[PDB]
Amino acid sequence: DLIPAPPLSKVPLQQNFQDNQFHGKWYVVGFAENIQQREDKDPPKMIATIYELKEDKSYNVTNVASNWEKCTYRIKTFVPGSQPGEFTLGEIKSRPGMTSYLVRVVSTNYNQHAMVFFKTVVQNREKFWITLYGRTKELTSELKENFIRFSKSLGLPENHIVFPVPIDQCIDG
Ligand SMILES: O=C(CC(O)(CC(=O)NCCCCNCCCNC(=O)c1ccc(O)c(O)c1)C(=O)O)NCCCCNCCCNC(=O)c1ccc(O)c(O)c1
């Protein structure tokens, strides 16, 4: 029953993607995925994803998160794909059984919010998710509604949609 990925042609790409303007810290204020919202857990803590543009035009991507022990810094590379705003994972060989990792910036105004679509295939199991990014940790009802609406348009119902809890530890860095 795991929810199938939509066809990539149904996933918008941000027109005229500006990689310099997309840089820096985004708070992951919402997310939806085909796999789960788990189902035996308190609501998750917010993470930050930091996009640093390298000289070769790929992104160094740092996920900053809080766990009971400490702040974690998980780093990967987004290499440009065929169109501005599309990426694939540099370190794909480091993911056992992974044959594909695709990123598509669906929309953004650069200084406030973004939505990013992700898709992965690992031993022929397809996973996809959408993140709602904010330059601030709080966002308007307006944006939360757009995101919910977008998620549903990709076949993700409301019980697959999660709004992480803002924290100060780790992600204020
Ligand atoms: O196999 C995976 C899954 C995946 O490749 C992709 C995946 O399925 N992501 C699911 C994210 C669902 C949304 N979660 C809630 C929202 C907050 N998270 C994100 O926005 C987000 C977005 C993208 C990510 O890849 C990610 O990890 C998280 C991934 O990188 O997470 N991860 C483990 C990789 C192990 C690498 N070898 C061990 C070294 C230690 N790990 C890392 O350094 C590292 C670095 C960057 C990573 O993204 C990472 O997951 C691990």
Ligand SMILES: [Ga+3]
């Ligand atoms: Ga990861």
